[PDB]
């Protein structure tokens, strides 16, 4: 389990859980399609940048710890 | 108990990829596009420019990334495909069988669209010795394909290319010439910036291009190579090596372009070239969307698209083994494409990421015209500009509907006719519209001329027998009739023509060349030498009804006196020695076409105010002999003989149709009711037989099929009269004339779909309402990063005025070209700007026609969400429109300035809007829903009764226990369901004497909502963010009173495409009610209950069946598909069930000898749900 990214354990805080589901988010955002559309609908921004704009987050998806 | 049923009536439209390839194992080239959960595959003609669909399958899994490679010495094509599986399917097409063949699966993750299993990228070695799956982040599985001696592809066991704490952006193939297999990949390592309090290592942490070499001696895998870019890069571009071109990778980045080979090659790289003058916000970058390649033996180039739509030729020049510069050209502009192929043969294919896609034929490769060239090595600092011009290298070839994204849908019967209709808010920004759904039989307008007065009839009359093509349309009014030639120019002939000013009741070819008009006041016979011979009507009686032939005229003139004439042989006609009358008067006769062999028709039907029909002989024999009577359920309205056997068809007043057999004598019979409208029968000439055309509130077709009868209707409005048509311009249509309007018309597809009308629009729409007196529609136009019309105009002028500053004096003729010029929108892009600012619009439309009632431009940074159209109890019967809005709305973080409420008088029944108030308040109101005379709105988590004043909107009552964001309000009549952002539905009642909004239910799970529909006064069917739709439903024994209620769900089902729009309504008349749905890729679905235990058990053991005999094809588990986010709750997947005609027949025999019954009765037995619920028009 531990081999496995985004387990965690008891000595895990906050910010490594919820950065570990805001980045399990955005990788679900680029896989699942629909969302992807829906998330280009809301802001005017093609497909592309959206899903660049995703990746972009994924070095600090919130913040420095 | 509740169990449902899904199906889907028309599939998803949007295009997520596309690649073409030899796929049929011929010179053919064929594309396989990806729809998201349905894999098709499509032939482009290169004679006729259309694009044709061989193939469309669901594969019950998320498609998240497609590839087509070969073999060495390979002549077709296989298909890759990363799903939301995990495992890697490889597929061949098989023409013989018209079905994707699973050559090979092979596991290694777990399912779903997770964050560190492959299955995200896919990248092929351009030879075919190799394929890549990887995920966004660490794991990276690399398979080796080799064909046996049987030329069976196999492949290999995985080869792991692991790398921890690793994102990547894409994964390319690198062409190298047979030497090691190279795959290079953007990553970005964010271990250091997991370990920085400070945030500086997440700044300065640049993405690294690296190449992975699979060493084939070796059998493993290794960095070979790595080296960080300047800016960050969103794809790559395959670089043809080997023999054709030098190898390397063209690394696509924010303004830039980078030919980056590794080795000795130094980086090449070119800005991205501007428009002439962007309106757009110059702080924002720009980036290609998509890029297509090219590769010929002689040359390559590639075609790289921009956020604009601007599609470049990007070419290179080389020099001994290295690469010189980068040349890009403008090529033209389309809309913003997710893929491209370019195809042999000349055409480019264009998936619009969002609404239609378009096929164009490539007239010239982009040279050899005066337009500028831009090159790496041309010194700047600054970036090259051009002019955006019209489509001059493409010309448009097809264009195929696309109705993604529909955001929102009305199904209702706002037309004339009686099946409703499928109103359906959808589209991108400028592309949008407003499309009506028919589903039907497509009618493809040849040409509409409109019509003075009110037309009544109209025939199609040759000049000869022999003539393969008609000479005369003869429209008849109410006081005139008029002909007109359809020669080059269809223009109208009066001298050729004869007839008269009196209205015509008929007009045909009777002799080989002799025309015979028949008028109420007589018939008129013109002989192809112009000799005219002219029948007054006996005494001051007048002309009733007709009935025509090749060599017969039978007239039925006022007191049902029928006077007959036959023709002979010399040319002229002979009236019979007898006059028969009837038991009543004559409202409508047929007589059947001669045989080619015989000189007459025996059977003539006569229709008598009688309520009945009679069959009379015309056999010199029995001449003017009754045979065989018939009593009928009204008055009849037509009659209409025709050969497939004999039948008589009967149109009545009401709107019954009746089709019998006849002989020497009337049989049995069916009917059907068509009502609303009377039945005429016409007759019509489909696919060289013989075909009926019943006109009531729709024009239906009855013809027959291999002794199998159809009566599919057409998607079109209504139709007063028509008759069969065939000229060099349309060799086999129809002329129709309806309402002041006379319209050519043909039939050329047979296969019955959802066919639209599109309105264009300007915005999204977000909402539109339904007017009851005026039938119109008010919809709001909400666009983020948008100019208003105003705005753009205010910074066009001042981009003018900023541009005469330079000294130069050609600054006012530039400024007179830019300023005359408002280049479309609709194809050029909208131009877009500002991450707070927006663009509304509401507007009155008509959805008859296309035309706008009313145009009213918001403010500049005002963003319209919610709209409703209702009345108060406080006033009278005076309409208003309340119109929600949000000002200075920023995403991303969410912050919000302010928001208002328009409110509109309506006026002029739904054709203006007249200003009243505007309310502000502090959060945005998404929600306004019409509530006991008053209004219910949401602003924010705070759901608020509200009343109209003269001045403003009073606030009379308040609730703020709402968890987060309301996003809809639903009301029944006693009532109130709210859809929290995130928290499912709430359920609240409304104490009228102290106007207390008290919480008395909500749900035990949290459910991002779209949208939803109150199915009765407990339950309600609510759709989810994530693609899952599902019934939630009160206990029984409750009261609004009692506090705290867990509502129960009842149903779960993840439909696998986000849902947007729930109705419970029923689509043909006779029908069941249906819960039809709608979804973010343009499709459209319905949910349909069971009426029995037994059919549940049954299609729950046919579901059971084929996910085991028939597996999803991306190796997805069928059940853990729809168990997606909550596991499936009492719904039968009828999408798989309806695959059971796809199986093998020993597969059909297992299954339906399981369930004791055959696969045709199977097959009935799944029909029955569409005969049901939705289209059957099989006509026994």
Known sequence: ?65 | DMFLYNLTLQRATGISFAIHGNFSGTKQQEIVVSRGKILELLRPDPNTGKVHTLLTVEVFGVIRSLMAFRLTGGTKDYIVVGSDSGRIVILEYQPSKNMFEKIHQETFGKSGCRRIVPGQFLAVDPKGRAVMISAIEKQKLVYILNRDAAARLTISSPLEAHKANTLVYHVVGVDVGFENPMFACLEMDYEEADNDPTGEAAANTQQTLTFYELDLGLNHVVRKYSEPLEEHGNFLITVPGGSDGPSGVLICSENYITYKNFGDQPDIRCPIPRRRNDLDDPERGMIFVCSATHKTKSMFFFLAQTEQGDIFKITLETDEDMVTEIRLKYFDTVPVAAAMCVLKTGFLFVASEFGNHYLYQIAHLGDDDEEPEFSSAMPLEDTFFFQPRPLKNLVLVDELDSLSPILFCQIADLANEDTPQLYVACGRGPRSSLRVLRHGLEVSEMAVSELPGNPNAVWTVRRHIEDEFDAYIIVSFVNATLVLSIGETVEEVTDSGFLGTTPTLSCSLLGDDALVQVYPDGIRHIRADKRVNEWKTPGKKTIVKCAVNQRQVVIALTGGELVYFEMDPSGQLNEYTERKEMSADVVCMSLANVPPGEQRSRFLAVGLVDNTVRIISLDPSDCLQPLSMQALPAQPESLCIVEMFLYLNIGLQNGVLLRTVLDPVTGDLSDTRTGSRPVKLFRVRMQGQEAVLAMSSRSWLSYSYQSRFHLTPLSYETLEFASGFASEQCPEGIVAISTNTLRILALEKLGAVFNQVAFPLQYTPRKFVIHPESNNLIIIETDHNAYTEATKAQRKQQMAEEMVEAAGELAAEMAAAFLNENLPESIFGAPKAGNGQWASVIRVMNPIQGNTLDLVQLEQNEAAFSVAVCRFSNTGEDWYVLVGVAKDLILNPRSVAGGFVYTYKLVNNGEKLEFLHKTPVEEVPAAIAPFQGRVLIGVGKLLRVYDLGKKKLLRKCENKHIANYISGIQTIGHRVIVSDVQESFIWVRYKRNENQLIIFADDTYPRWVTTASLLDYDTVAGADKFGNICVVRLPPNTNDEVDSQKAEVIMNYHVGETVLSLQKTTLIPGGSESLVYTTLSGGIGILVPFTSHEDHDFFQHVEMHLRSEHPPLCGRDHLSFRSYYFPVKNVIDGDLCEQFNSMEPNKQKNVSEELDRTPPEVSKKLEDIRTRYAFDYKDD
């Open chain 1, 1 to 65: 389990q531990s081999k496995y990214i985004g387990t965690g354990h008891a000595d895990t805080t906050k910010w490594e859980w919820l950065v570990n589901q805001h980045r399990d988010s955005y990788c679900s955002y680029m896989g699942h399609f629909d969302l992807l559309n829906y998330f280009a609908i809301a802001e005017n921004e093609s497909k592309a940048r959206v899903r660049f704009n995703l990746m972009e987050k994924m070095l600090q998806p919130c913040g420095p710890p």
